[PDB]
Amino acid sequence: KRKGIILAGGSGTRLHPATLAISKQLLPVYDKPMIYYPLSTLMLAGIREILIISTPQDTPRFQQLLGDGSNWGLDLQYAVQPSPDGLAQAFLIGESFIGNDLSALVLGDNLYYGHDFHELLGSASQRQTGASVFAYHVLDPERYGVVEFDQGGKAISLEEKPLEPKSNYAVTGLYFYDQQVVDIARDLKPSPRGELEITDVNRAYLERGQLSVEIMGRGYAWLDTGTHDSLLEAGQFIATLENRQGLKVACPEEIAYRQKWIDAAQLEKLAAPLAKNGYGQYLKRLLTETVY
Amino acid sequence: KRKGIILAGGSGTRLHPATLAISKQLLPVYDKPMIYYPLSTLMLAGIREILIISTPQDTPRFQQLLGDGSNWGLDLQYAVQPSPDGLAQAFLIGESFIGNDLSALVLGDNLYYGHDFHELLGSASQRQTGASVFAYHVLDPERYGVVEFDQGGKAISLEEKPLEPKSNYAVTGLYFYDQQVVDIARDLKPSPRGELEITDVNRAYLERGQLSVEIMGRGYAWLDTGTHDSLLEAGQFIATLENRQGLKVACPEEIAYRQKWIDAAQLEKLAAPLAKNGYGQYLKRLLTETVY
Amino acid sequence: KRKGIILAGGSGTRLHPATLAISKQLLPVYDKPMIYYPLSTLMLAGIREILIISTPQDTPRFQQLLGDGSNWGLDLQYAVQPSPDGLAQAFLIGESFIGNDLSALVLGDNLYYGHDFHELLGSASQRQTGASVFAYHVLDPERYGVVEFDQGGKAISLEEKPLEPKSNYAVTGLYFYDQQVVDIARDLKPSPRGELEITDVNRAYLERGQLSVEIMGRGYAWLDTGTHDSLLEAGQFIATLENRQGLKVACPEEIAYRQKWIDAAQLEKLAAPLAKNGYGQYLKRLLTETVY
Amino acid sequence: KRKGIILAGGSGTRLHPATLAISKQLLPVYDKPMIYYPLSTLMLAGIREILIISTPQDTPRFQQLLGDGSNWGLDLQYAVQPSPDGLAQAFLIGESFIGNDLSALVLGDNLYYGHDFHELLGSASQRQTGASVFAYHVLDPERYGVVEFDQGGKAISLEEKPLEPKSNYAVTGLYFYDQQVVDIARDLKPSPRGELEITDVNRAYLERGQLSVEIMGRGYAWLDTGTHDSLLEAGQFIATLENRQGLKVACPEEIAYRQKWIDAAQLEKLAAPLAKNGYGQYLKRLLTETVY
Numbered sequence A, B, C, D: 001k002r003k004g005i006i007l008a009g010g011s012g013t014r015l016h017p018a019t020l021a022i023s024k025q026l027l028p029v030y031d032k033p034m035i036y037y038p039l040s041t042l043m044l045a046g047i048r049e050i051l052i053i054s055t056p057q058d059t060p061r062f063q064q065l066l067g068d069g070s071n072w073g074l075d076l077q078y079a080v081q082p083s084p085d086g087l088a089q090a091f092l093i094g095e096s097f098i099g100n101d102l103s104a105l106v107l108g109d110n111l112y113y114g115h116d117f118h119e120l121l122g123s124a125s126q127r128q129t130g131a132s133v134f135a136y137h138v139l140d141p142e143r144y145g146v147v148e149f150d151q152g153g154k155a156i157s158l159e160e161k162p163l164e165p166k167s168n169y170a171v172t173g174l175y176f177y178d179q180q181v182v183d184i185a186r187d188l189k190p191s192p193r194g195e196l197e198i199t200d201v202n203r204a205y206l207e208r209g210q211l212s213v214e215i216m217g218r219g220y221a222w223l224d225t226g227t228h229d230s231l232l233e234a235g236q237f238i239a240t241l242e243n244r245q246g247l248k249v250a251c252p253e254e255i256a257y258r259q260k261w262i263d264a265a266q267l268e269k270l271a272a273p274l275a276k277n278g279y280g281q282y283l284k285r286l287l288t289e290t291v292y
């Protein structure tokens, strides 16, 4: 039984002034609010019960957008992070939400895509012990937590935004944890940067030999909407896929309906209000087309 | 003395579900909120006193983003449009704001760009009588108010969203009016579509021989953020200009400063809070570079 | 042992006038000539011996570009298609090249991408019987060979460019064949459309119960560079992947090297002449980085 | 009467390996060969007699593409530049083509666009003395000839690819010359970079107080297809304009027709062969639509 968390706060600065207008996680990536992406990521890892964290000012807005999740077969809840003091805070704010369950954390501005993605998630959701994260080759490792491998391919060290990255593998923003995480996070101290760093959390598991690091191959897409350029590219990336396939990426209604969290009647009923536009039309069409 | 209006309402359905979390006019075009564009359009027509109209729920968010305009040497005010019942409603809603002055209306999801644009504006701002609009050759005239010319090149008729457009010239979303507009708009009746149509307003002036229709040539760009694709193209269009020139489009602080609505000290001060990101850096650089 | 064919002729009227002077398959997708893509596809299916077919005027060009393939561990050969009379003609023109081997055909303007793409290719290249093709869900099935499935998910019909597609699954431009293909192609007659249609070849296998149709899921990317727009989208799609990952797509040197068809010293030598620019620099970097 | 030159050689290494296969000036920018762009620029400056320079191997291909120009009312000629030894060589290779006339040089991978661009060209093309060039604010002045102004906005120095640019204004690749240029070019000596530099030409005119430097404002688009990314951006830029307006950029047939260098019947005849695709359809449509 795994609970999930979407960390969808932050200040947004790289994007000023676009995001003085709205939290980054409410902006669209092509055709739908950014947060739908990571939401669909948890959903495809089979997690139905999820906690959305954001700023004090934006939390109501996410609530207004997503409601309690029942319409999608989900159980959504909300909490505020008073200040963007680090990804690890997720576990402190989310302590009572998690209780004694397995958990998973995804960053609100991270967008995943690829064939068999859901089998990659599945394998991590199902380890009931230790922690799991994913390594992805990128151009600018210095912008992330970087993971170093020995010649045998084993992970041996982790560094957060190193001036001299030891490899080009970044740890992406998707993390699976067992019941140690809360206590690990309680005992962290701010880093030099002054954050409670998820990298320290991951280092703790590593130092116990309990961190599993799976490679996410060049074949998947792992984009982040951190900068005006990357936001734009992810936008074009999605549009290209959607207009070629006639299938839509990270549309929660669809995923719900394919996982059987809602039935045909429910989907029909999600469609109606949205029927005048292409999104609703797409939802309806799913009721009459078999998609492998 | 011309007052201006930005009609930034609408239900924004073609963009669902992207616009469920919020109003189209708050989304970014590349690097700044959409409404900056039209705002900078009025600003370049030399208009400093401006009414912003939006839905009741979005109104407060515009305010939050633009304040009263004093920091940019503007005088901004706000009004609500309870429902999107037609672009002509702007003149009803805006009646008291206008008083007895000349006025100008720009749609909040309209984006203009081009050499000598501001001379084009100037020439219309300065007619003190009649109305002025602009015609632009487009691919899909049927989506707009279309204007027909006789072989002499004179405008002779206007139709809104005609099934059989009589030409490929659309009237864009930028309108200049003298003091007859409020009364013209008070005597309108909803069209078959059920809107109080700016096209009817324009026809009234045309039937009196007082509508001026200038061509906005192929050289200018007139883009609309109406659909997910066009929104995306507008974003890429701006980013291309900005990254080639190192100059920014529709950055109100800059415009204010160049028009002398604020001085160097003010601009420095606007920069500070935005200094950690590129936008601030750009503002600062304007204090030490001469840009012709 | 399977032999491969890249059909890289056509007239490309859809790209006129861009292709008046030269063949579609020599224009770039972002950073490399188009034909590198499908070449890399055959290479990842483990095919090293390949026949490239083009128009009489462009074949020399391809020769000048790719040479005999030795530098990349390949064995490239060339043949002319005097007129674009159908994709099946690949099997006539290529008869003697094929001899008595298994073969594969890939269209020169098709571009694939995705995780585990190389396992999908492997499975098909190893059948030693019948034929294999791939179905991909697309927006405009009417532009391709379309395959209908029964409720059991079993392929039951195929039509080329139907006005009323029976499904949204298009057969893509990648085909694997056993030793029956040449005789099937010999007995074809021109279609109403005036072509010797691969779709008829595929139907012939289907009629004997020997056509295997695997789904290529929404997780993979299948783009076609047929139109100005799609060619442009394909270019942006590749750049996004390449600028995020720091890895390059369909770079034959790399693939050769990773398959061990050339060694480090050969790669090194392929890099030198290209060292002044990014592509060579990339080839070098591969000698000193481990990429999972 | 001014004669024009398009310098369309180079090795375009920055584009390898895409340009191993085709000169950079033959690759498409969206929907037409790159060279159509600068060709159209000279055409808009009223120049009908034009010399196209390229590498020994690509010249033939340009010939094949453009012919002698008679079909478009132009008089095209060709010459080879044995090696890319500097833009100024244009004037040595073009000496006899030039004779005793005014001349103009445009770089083959330069693309201009903007309202009143044709008036800007006209002004310069009509000076009958001295030289005229254009300064355009850009992000990376260090990659071009850079021009410095004094506080009175008067040009006072020019440097080619300076490590420490004295301003952000690049001299673009469009140059107008009186009868002094050939002699100025004959006395140049190779620069440290080993090129006969047009910047030296321009400086020679500056030292004599006869170089006119006009600003090309942020309102115009000045793009260069020098890198894979910039090529891609230019493509997306043109497509956005073309799909919004239903007009095409730099289509020589149209330009020829609008300038009356060919008549309706000729245009009709250029369209036939191209009638099956959009580009011919567009040429036809111009015979029945008035475009302001």
Ligand SMILES: Cc1cn([C@H]2C[C@H](O)[C@@H](COP(=O)(O)OP(=O)(O)OP(=O)(O)O)O2)c(=O)[nH]c1=O
Pocket: A007, A008, A009, A010, A011, A012, A013, A014, A015, A024, A053, A054, A081, A083, A084, A085, A086, A087, A089, A107, A108, A109, A110, A226
């Ligand atoms: C640091 C942090 C990030 N987040 C979220 C926001 C982002 O989606 C994601 C990563 O944020 P970042 O990528 O670290 O960037 P940021 O949102 O802090 O703003 P900036 O670009 O100015 O650096 O995690 C939180 O929710 N709380 C936090 O304390």
Ligand SMILES: Cc1cn([C@H]2C[C@H](O)[C@@H](COP(=O)(O)OP(=O)(O)OP(=O)(O)O)O2)c(=O)[nH]c1=O
Pocket: B007, B008, B009, B010, B011, B012, B013, B014, B015, B053, B054, B081, B083, B084, B085, B086, B087, B089, B107, B108, B109, B110, B226
């Ligand atoms: C009609 C209308 C438009 N607008 C704004 C919204 C748009 O920016 C612009 C044009 O509106 P439209 O784009 O014509 O329609 P819309 O904005 O409701 O969007 P959609 O049709 O997809 O639902 O003017 C108002 O602010 N109030 C209005 O009554």
Ligand SMILES: Cc1cn([C@H]2C[C@H](O)[C@@H](COP(=O)(O)OP(=O)(O)OP(=O)(O)O)O2)c(=O)[nH]c1=O
Pocket: B215, B216, B217, B218, B219, B220, D040, D044, D112, D113, D114, D115, D116, D117, D118, D119, D248, D249, D250, D251, D254, D255, D258, D292
């Ligand atoms: C006429 C024409 C222009 N262009 C380009 C040239 C210019 O960069 C740009 C602008 O045309 P210009 O005539 O320079 O400017 P414009 O057409 O907007 O101005 P107006 O309508 O008031 O006369 O379009 C073409 O690409 N093809 C053409 O046929």
Ligand SMILES: Cc1cn([C@H]2C[C@H](O)[C@@H](COP(=O)(O)OP(=O)(O)OP(=O)(O)O)O2)c(=O)[nH]c1=O
Pocket: C007, C008, C009, C010, C011, C012, C013, C014, C015, C053, C054, C081, C083, C084, C085, C086, C087, C089, C107, C108, C109, C110, C226
């Ligand atoms: C029909 C045909 C195609 N081809 C290649 C060309 C393409 O890469 C691919 C598909 O061709 P098409 O995509 O069918 O397009 P085309 O190249 O025939 O030209 P047009 O756009 O004007 O229709 O197959 C051949 O090599 N020989 C042929 O006879």
Ligand SMILES: Cc1cn([C@H]2C[C@H](O)[C@@H](COP(=O)(O)OP(=O)(O)OP(=O)(O)O)O2)c(=O)[nH]c1=O
Pocket: A216, A217, A218, A219, A220, C040, C044, C112, C113, C114, C115, C116, C117, C118, C119, C248, C249, C250, C251, C254, C255, C258, C292
């Ligand atoms: C290896 C390699 C693959 N590709 C392509 C082939 C595929 O479409 C795609 C993905 O490679 P695949 O090997 O299909 O998938 P992957 O690399 O993610 O698999 P793995 O988990 O084992 O690491 O990238 C290249 O373009 N160049 C290459 O060198």
Ligand SMILES: Cc1cn([C@H]2C[C@H](O)[C@@H](COP(=O)(O)OP(=O)(O)OP(=O)(O)O)O2)c(=O)[nH]c1=O
Pocket: A040, A044, A112, A113, A114, A115, A116, A117, A118, A119, A248, A249, A250, A251, A254, A255, A258, A292, C215, C216, C217, C218, C219, C220
């Ligand atoms: C099923 C589904 C997938 N996705 C995303 C998740 C995946 O990253 C990506 C790929 O779909 P997957 O089902 O993960 O892979 P696939 O569908 O290609 O595999 P197959 O077709 O053979 O079953 O698409 C959605 O966005 N929405 C959906 O409804």
Ligand SMILES: Cc1cn([C@H]2C[C@H](O)[C@@H](COP(=O)(O)OP(=O)(O)OP(=O)(O)O)O2)c(=O)[nH]c1=O
Pocket: D007, D008, D009, D010, D011, D012, D013, D014, D015, D053, D054, D081, D083, D084, D085, D086, D087, D107, D108, D109, D110, D226
């Ligand atoms: C230097 C030179 C350029 N050209 C053309 C090519 C270009 O369009 C334009 C400018 O060339 P450049 O942009 O200076 O560079 P290049 O084209 O040689 O390519 P690269 O730098 O990547 O190797 O001038 C010539 O035709 N002859 C020349 O001698």
Ligand SMILES: Cc1cn([C@H]2C[C@H](O)[C@@H](COP(=O)(O)OP(=O)(O)OP(=O)(O)O)O2)c(=O)[nH]c1=O
Pocket: B040, B044, B112, B113, B114, B115, B116, B117, B118, B119, B248, B249, B250, B251, B254, B255, B258, B292, D215, D216, D217, D218, D219, D220
């Ligand atoms: C001055 C300025 C203009 N713009 C916009 C308005 C116009 O659409 C476009 C061009 O402005 P204009 O000043 O009209 O065009 P220009 O600068 O090319 O004219 P010139 O140099 O000959 O004086 O750029 C901004 O976006 N920000 C600004 O600060």
